[model samples]
Target: NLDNKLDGFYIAPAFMDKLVVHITKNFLKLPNIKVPLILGIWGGKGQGKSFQCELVFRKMGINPIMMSAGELESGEPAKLIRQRYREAAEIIRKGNMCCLFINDLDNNQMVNATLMNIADNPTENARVPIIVTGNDFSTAPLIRDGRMEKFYWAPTREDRIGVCTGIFRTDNVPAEDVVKIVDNFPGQSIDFFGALRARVYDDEVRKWVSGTGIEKIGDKLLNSFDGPPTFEQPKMTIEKLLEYGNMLVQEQENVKRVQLADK
Candidate 1:
């Protein structure tokens, strides 16, 4: 029996299209079902594939066994996997569900050989589900028909709005300001909003440092056990957000300006 550990959330309507994607992709599993033991979530880097996965895991109340490319090549692949798998296996028996998570599988297809073995022979393995991140497809052997499931993350229109509420909420932006910010850059990824929030505040921080003089405050600011003081948040005016958003877009466009790099 597959363990279902659905839990509570205030982050409800968690606003992630991908959060619900894998579940929707495999809801028929309870039909005594053919569900792949692996789920691959692919997307552009800044789009928060791993971050959103953590959010989904938190809401689902599942324990996570985190893996990195470093560990994948750290030593003997088979030995390390058994050690890692056993840890997750035992952890899951004590809880409702446990999943193995790996970031940027596109870089380390080396893992495919290892995981493919486990996927095909689950009888010898624990029921730990596997999840991976990256925006590329791979080995026909790995994802074909009965072995793996796939989901591509794309934040919905409403997702951007609800997500901004969380990002700008504590800053006390006008409720309407957040809406306008989302409206202004519908083309940008979610991280751009988060980064834009930071971009707006840097000016205030520099202004705070101006009076004290940067050199003089260096030690005190860094050495203080009491910690650096919080800078007053800059206004969350739509104009300010739009201004910052435009700057971010220009910088991002600079990277894509290399479309000729394609040729």
Candidate 2:
């Protein structure tokens, strides 16, 4: 049986659209009643392909079998697959249609061969849905005949900043500084948000300038950053950067926090 471990929200845009595409592209074209829809999701590590699948799975509220192609590549391909198909068939017989989400199938020869088999005769494979996720379709052989619909997964610095802000639940914090913090970290989206949330607990508000609570919130995010303090550089011109940095310094009992007028 395919193990399903779907969780996490998809921050990337168009995640829902690609999911719908997978369902239609594979299942709709099939004439056989026994076969579940076959789809392939493709993305690289840390690109949030699994997270995208989780969003769709949660909305559907069904336990779809999620597997990794790379993990499956180590052993007997056909023999192991026949067993998985058996388990999937059982899931289908239980009145729940199963979708096999193949995640991280990047150029694994054995897994691609299995995917080819499923594409050619999905009913014989176990009649369960087949979906693959990976980012390296450019080089991955699993995408032959376009059996898998490709969805490019990426987020811009602006989008990343917004995600960081929302996740930390500090929407009111000046956005420009948050964007800088996120961009500076490059691919570390989780860290940016985690640090932001940790820094601004309500009690820290007393240490901020103007006593408006905004400074307190900013300070919290600044202090909790896992990366080096970036706002300390004099090169930053964003008003929020100066505000956030100064508040963080004050909270730490620095003699003087840098100041920037609301220019």
Candidate 3:
């Protein structure tokens, strides 16, 4: 049975449910049944596609062999994948289910080749799934076939609020405070909330560490399970998140221009 929890992190429920079904089908070992062995998870940057994949594996108690797109191109990719699949099989022999995680598959040229190899020679751990993450599916033609299942992860305001509140769980901060921050910065990525959390804590962390008061204040101020000293939200308003998001968008555009020029 797959637990809905993603390593105690919050994932959008619909996406979680779909992933569970995919995993179940892959592991169901029925003769002559063809279940999707590869999963292509697409989402915007910082939307937690890769993060959720990790959590899903953890929830199912599977140890994952992770690889980056760059890793696949570093050497003979087909051989490397075969080696890794053998290693995954060894882990399965030890009574542990293993998975292969490829991050940013869109950037790898060998995705098609590797997928072909896996499809051709089913490993001993044939049920072992291959999960790939990409920011966009436009270039993922190879994985778009029947052997692959596609999913998209889009976190909503409530989902972002849950993540934000979870970050400040030990802090006795009001949920509304987190909600206010998330509401202000609507449509921002999960990384935006992560940045906001840091922004909120930066000043207090500095105050707690600096000055002679640091010794008197003790580590309790820095690390507290009872309650945080203050619940005041940081000055990271919507404008700030928007400003940063715009800068990121511009940078991405610039990169695209450069790629175009190079091509």
Candidate 4:
């Protein structure tokens, strides 16, 4: 129901705008340097790496020269490497400014030899602003050593707070009680916002039960003080649960005897 009524959920318009601004600033502020200047993006997989890249490309009005370093490790090594280098060079030549996205930097066992050449001699193809994204780039030699400008990509608990506040404001949700919901969400604001939107659309689930005296709210409001059950994550993953249990026994315990006894 709310989908038809409040379908166009515009929660993070400001935040989205900020993303655009950030991409713009990063792209334009390239120091008047030589071919080797690279912008490296390091983030965990699915932390929206490709999405971030696409957004930047859209704002810039030109597609970035993108090449997956992982793909360069294919069986047809010669073909893949040659193709990638050619594409990188082509992008640099045509686009004048391309964001070379080598998705998985760790699995570049085969491509390692050519990696340095591409970064150091980007002009061998073209002077493109190379932006490489990887899972763990801390050890990647090509990533460090002043060859690339590294930017960390991960949102902390505080970032979730802003995401929640933005959701409330854009949804036309009453400001009077937004903080209660926002604070409750803490580290799970992104998920909480999504849940809130889902609840707003369901008739049976749309109710807020709290001292705040608010009415006609999504089910999430009644469901949690620290966000809803979905947001109130316990060690759902078995491995994580075991890890936590181990930490409690090994680290959290005041005494080894207590740990053994508890075990």
Candidate 5:
């Protein structure tokens, strides 16, 4: 009964329902006609791949054991991966549905070997569903059928506008202005849109700090850390958003040119 509580995610309801159904079927150990045991979500940088997967898990009312390369402290990476998956599977046996989430699988070593273990090792936990997110899937050929399935995450124009609009809601800006800003930054990552949203307050914050002086700002900062409402919040507008958008575009282009030169 998780009724669309997540914000800034605009997945199609019918498609999402199907995904939930497929996952639920596998969790029950039912005969999945075509669903794979492991689901791989691949997308461009800052495209909300992990965010969307988390939302899906939330909808299914399952807590996933999220693992990453940095979090694995043991020298034996393969052993640690298997240990975590087995632990999560134990939780499933104890009446709680769980899944294994391996973030940035491509960045880590021995991922393919570990997956092979999951598929072949009789000692490993074979029932726990696995969901992973990555920027590319050149490793797809290694993933055999029935063991894994891949899905591409590419948001449409309306999806972009919807997410941007949700973030802009906190700033109380005009909807049309948000749409215009999104339109100006075509093919930009979701992170770029978030950065643009934060930039809307640059001028106002500077003005407030300069006019109020550092002494007051410092006190306000300390007070905010202790509680709330220590400083005046900035009001965002269409003009200010557009101005920041232009600056952001130029800054991004400059960075891109430098990267190209280095290459």
Candidate 6:
């Protein structure tokens, strides 16, 4: 019913172009090249930002020596910025394609200055392509010139179905049931389905805790005197799936309760 571009998963064509083209072009010898130096990949949390990268990078034979938001905001000599660029460069120096990766979802004039300086001369050095990931721009979340070319990673409803299907590949949940769960929680991210699958297993843990008696549970669990409990694939009927989906939605709201701060 949907195009599973990567066969096993959905890799949006726009995303693939930004990721693949950006890294590949940097290692080229073309004269007067003008590909953006920084490629920002932005999307809401759990939208499969890194997962798609892991799958794609594996296929393309590129290892991401990615840095993160920690050092930039947390404080460091800041000279370490140069160190990170060199690390990715050293990879290309050894014959490879790479991006000076960032797991950002930023501050410091020092960090800002260095980024500005690099963009000013993106063609010099190993010219390791730069990549950033975040929820916000790091404005409209921005329109920019070629200095930075970015793509927003998002999943369509059909794409969501594809991801949810892969999640239950071994569980044998009914196809219609999986679609029901996905469409019902259309606002949720890829993780909700994974967590729901995981949540169903907790049912086994509950039944065992009761059978073993909460009093004897500690000893029975650790000593393995009861032949280590086996999980009888918990029945994943559509009713139970929707029930758990609702329960998870509550926990999800608890997170969104940041609105409570406004009050």
- TM-scores of the models, in the given order? 0.75, 0.54, 0.70, 0.49, 0.79, 0.80
Q: Tens digits of per-residue lDDT for model 6 on 15-85? A: 56667877777667778866677777777356677776765666577787767687666635366667888
Off by over 4 Å in 1: 1-32, 107-110, 123-125, 140-142, 219-230, 250-263
* lDDT value, residue 126 of candidate 6: 67
TM-score for candidate 4, residues paired by index: 0.49
Task: Write model 4 residue lDDT over 1-263, tens digit each, in one string.
Answer: 11111222222233334334444443454677432345566652323455545644554555655566545665555456556556765865664544455555654444554556655554444444555666666655654664655666665433344444444444454443444554543433254355454444342222224433445345545556766534321212323323333443344346767768999
* Local distance difference test, each candidate: 0.65, 0.52, 0.65, 0.47, 0.68, 0.71
Off by over 4 Å in 5: 1-19, 29-34, 71-75, 106-109, 120-126, 173-175, 214-229, 257-263
The better-scoring model by TM-score among 4 and 6 is 6
Error of 6 at 164 (Å): 2.5
Q: What 10-residue stretch in candidate 6 is worst by lDDT?
A: 137-146
Clashing pairs in 6: 105-134
Indicate the residue-level lDDT of 118 in model 5: 79
Candidate number with the higher lDDT (5 or 6): 6
lDDT value for candidate 6? Answer: 0.71
- The most accurate candidate by lDDT is 6
Q: Each model's number of backbone clashes?
A: 0, 14, 0, 0, 0, 1
Q: Give the Cα error of residue 247 in candidate 1, in Å.
A: 3.5
Model 6 lDDT, residue 181, Cα: 88
lDDT of 3 by residue, 9-81 (tens): 6665666776767766766767997787777787645567676667667777777777776777775677777
Error of 2 at 250 (Å): 19
For candidate 5, write residues 160-242 as lDDT tens digits. Answer: 67666756666677778878878987887778878876775666677777887767776765656676334565676777777
